[PDB]
Every structure is written in structure tokens, then in C-alpha cells.
Design an enzyme around this catalytic site. Structure first.
Site, PDB file in Angstrom:
ATOM      1  N   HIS A 159       0.806  -1.210   0.000  1.00  0.00           N
ATOM      2  CA  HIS A 159       0.000   0.000   0.000  1.00  0.00           C
ATOM      3  C   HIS A 159       0.842   1.265   0.000  1.00  0.00           C
ATOM      4  O   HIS A 159       0.287   2.314  -0.297  1.00  0.00           O
ATOM      5  CB  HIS A 159      -1.063   0.048   1.096  1.00  0.00           C
ATOM      6  CG  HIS A 159      -0.609   0.460   2.459  1.00  0.00           C
ATOM      7  ND1 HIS A 159      -0.194  -0.442   3.429  1.00  0.00           N
ATOM      8  CD2 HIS A 159      -0.502   1.709   2.997  1.00  0.00           C
ATOM      9  CE1 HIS A 159       0.168   0.238   4.498  1.00  0.00           C
ATOM     10  NE2 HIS A 159      -0.030   1.532   4.277  1.00  0.00           N
TER      11      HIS A 159
ATOM     12  N   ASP B 139      -0.409  -7.466   2.085  1.00  0.00           N
ATOM     13  CA  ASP B 139       0.140  -6.122   1.954  1.00  0.00           C
ATOM     14  C   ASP B 139       1.660  -6.138   2.004  1.00  0.00           C
ATOM     15  O   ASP B 139       2.267  -5.892   3.046  1.00  0.00           O
ATOM     16  CB  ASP B 139      -0.509  -5.258   3.052  1.00  0.00           C
ATOM     17  CG  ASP B 139      -0.247  -3.775   2.850  1.00  0.00           C
ATOM     18  OD1 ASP B 139       0.231  -3.319   1.773  1.00  0.00           O
ATOM     19  OD2 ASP B 139      -0.477  -3.007   3.812  1.00  0.00           O
TER      20      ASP B 139
ATOM     21  N   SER C 290       3.690   3.189   8.257  1.00  0.00           N
ATOM     22  CA  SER C 290       3.395   2.131   7.307  1.00  0.00           C
ATOM     23  C   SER C 290       4.599   1.644   6.519  1.00  0.00           C
ATOM     24  O   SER C 290       5.400   2.487   6.144  1.00  0.00           O
ATOM     25  CB  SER C 290       2.531   2.704   6.120  1.00  0.00           C
ATOM     26  OG  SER C 290       1.229   2.590   6.585  1.00  0.00           O
TER      27      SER C 290
END
Lengths: 10, 27, 247
Positions: free
Chosen positions: C42, C98, C197
């Protein structure tokens, strides 16, 4: 911020 | 490789300030 | 990182900053060999926000500490040769799988501040991925949900039982994820936040004293909210894919 990085890394 | 052994910690036998908190949780 | 503290110099030498070469701090990542970086898919490909970065849009900054400061005679900045996203990354619903690998144009030289993390083997995953055991998250992400640190932050968090993870959210959880964080009655708190992230969730093996990357910071609902947990990509479940692309 973000201090500039040398132009070689582009 | 020589993975996961930090040059300034494991390699010198020095411990970081909170790694003992992890090891104490492993049982 | 919320409710974390400054990392010590060299404490997470596998930590990588993803940086737009345009500049802004895009995400975290981790160094797994002299030429390969691991991150969350992502960070690179997310159609809902029109995000689709290629190799020519990014720089990898390794050996950092200070978030904004170019750190000469310490950090190393590398260009990317190729990005590989998991073929079944499910950005439409879940963020299932992910994960993404980034191949560097040239090998980085290891130093006191740059050194790779190990990837778990089945036995390491079996002994360490247990409810209650703590792992560590690092990153330059925001300090609060609603604010940016000067230096790399660190927080230690316990892995939560799968039933508790599933009951804290409306999102469908899969076997390729795990959640971590303290419960509302646990006293302590802490979490990943915007900007963390793609970074690593690592654990130290009590068997051989090596650090292992078990998770990738993937998603959360807010940051450090009571009754909510951070969700991570399960690296060991996706290890065959990793080994295949690297070959």
C-alpha cells in the site's frame, strides 16, 4: 522541513 | 548472512534500553 | 509512533525511509539484504487515493535517525531498479497480502548504522508468534492521530489473540495478518501511526539472539485508540513468495 539532499541522487 | 546482529549492540555484547522487556515476555 | 520514545543510535539498522524524489516522506521499509528492501504494497500502490509509484519516483534512505536532516557520513541514499508487488495484494477490500519487494540499483555497503534484519524460518515463527509475546515497532510516523518526531521512535507491543483482533474491527481479518497492542485495561499504550506504514515489527529470538522481522506495519483505525489494535502483514506466511522473487 526536509533538508535538501545532494543533486546526484537527483 | 550475519543478519539481525547489530554492529553496536549484539556484536559488542551491549543491550539496548528496552530489549529486556521483550525477552521477559517470552514466557 | 504514538507513546514511543527516541531510538538509540544504531538500534534498528535495518530501518529504511521511502522518500519521493520529487520531497516527502512516503513510508517506512526494512533492509533484508545488500540489495533488497521490504515494505507494504500500500506504500506504492493504492488506487483509492490515486497512488501508483514506479521505480523512477522513489529513493530509499538507509542508516537514518533524524527524520528531516540529510545525514552525511552516515545515511546512504539508493535508487530503485525494480518494484515487485504481491500478485494477490487485495487493495479493494482488505489490504490482504500487503507486501512488496524493492530491488536496489547497486548494493549498499553495511556499516555500524546499516545492517539487515533476518526473515523468520517456520520454527522461529512457531515459537515467537504467540499472544502475549512482545515485538517492537520503529518509524518516523506521526506522534498522535490528530506532531512529527525529530528522530526515529520505538515502541514495544504485545501480540494479541486472534479472536480479540477479529472482534475489535468491522474489517475481515485473514490468516496473512496479526494484530498487536495493549488492551484498554492493560495500563500501557502505543501504536504505529501515519508515516509508520511499511516499517518492521521485529522480535529478538531468545535462542540465537538475532532480530527477526515478523511483521510489516499495515493498517489501523486511528492511532492508539482504546479497544483498537495495529494490524501487521504476517511475513512468515508470505515467505515463499519472497524467496521466489529474490531467487
Amino acid at each position: 522541513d526536509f533538508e535538501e539532499i545532494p543533486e546526484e541522487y537527483l | 548472512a550475519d543478519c539481525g546482529l547489530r554492529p553496536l549492540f549484539e556484536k559488542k555484547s551491549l543491550e539496548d534500553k528496552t530489549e529486556r522487556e521483550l525477552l521477559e515476555s517470552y514466557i | 509512533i504514538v507513546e514511543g520514545s527516541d531510538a538509540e543510535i544504531g538500534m534498528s539498522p535495518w530501518q529504511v525511509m521511502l522518500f519521493a524524489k520529487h520531497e516527502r516522506f512516503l513510508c517506512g521499509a526494512s533492509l533484508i539484504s545488500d540489495r533488497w528492501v521490504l515494505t507494504a504494497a500500500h506504500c506504492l500502490l493504492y488506487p483509492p487515493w490515486d497512488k501508483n509509484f514506479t521505480e523512477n519516483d522513489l529513493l530509499v534512505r538507509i542508516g537514518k535517525h533524524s527524520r528531516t536532516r540529510y545525514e552525511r557520513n552516515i545515511e546512504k541514499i539508493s535508487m530503485l531498479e525494480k518494484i515487485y508487488i504481491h500478485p494477490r495484494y487485495n487493495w479493494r477490500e482488505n489490504l490482504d497480502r500487503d507486501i512488496a519487494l524493492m530491488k536496489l540499483k547497486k548494493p549498499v555497503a553495511f556499516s555500524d548504522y546499516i545492517h539487515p534484519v533476518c526473515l523468520p524460518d517456520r520454527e522461529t515463527a512457531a515459537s515467537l508468534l504467540q499472544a502475549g509475546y512482545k515485538g517492537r515497532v520503529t518509524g518516523w510516523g506521526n506522534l498522535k492521530e490528530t506532531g512529527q518526531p525529530s528522530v526515529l521512535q520505538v515502541v514495544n507491543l504485545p501480540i494479541v489473540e486472534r479472536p480479540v483482533c477479529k472482534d475489535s474491527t468491522r474489517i475481515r481479518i485473514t490468516d496473512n495478518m496479526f494484530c498487536a497492542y495493549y488492551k484498554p485495561d492493560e495500563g500501557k499504550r502505543g501504536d504505529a501511526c501515519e508515516g509508520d506504514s511499511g516499517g518492521p515489527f521485529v522480535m529478538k529470538s531468545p535462542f540465537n539472539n538475532r532480530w527477526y522481522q515478523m511483521g510489516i506495519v499495515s493498517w489501523g483505525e486511528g492511532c492508539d485508540r482504546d479497544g483498537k489494535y495495529g494490524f501487521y502483514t504476517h511475513v512468515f506466511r508470505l515467505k515463499k513468495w519472497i524467496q521466489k522473487v529474490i531467487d
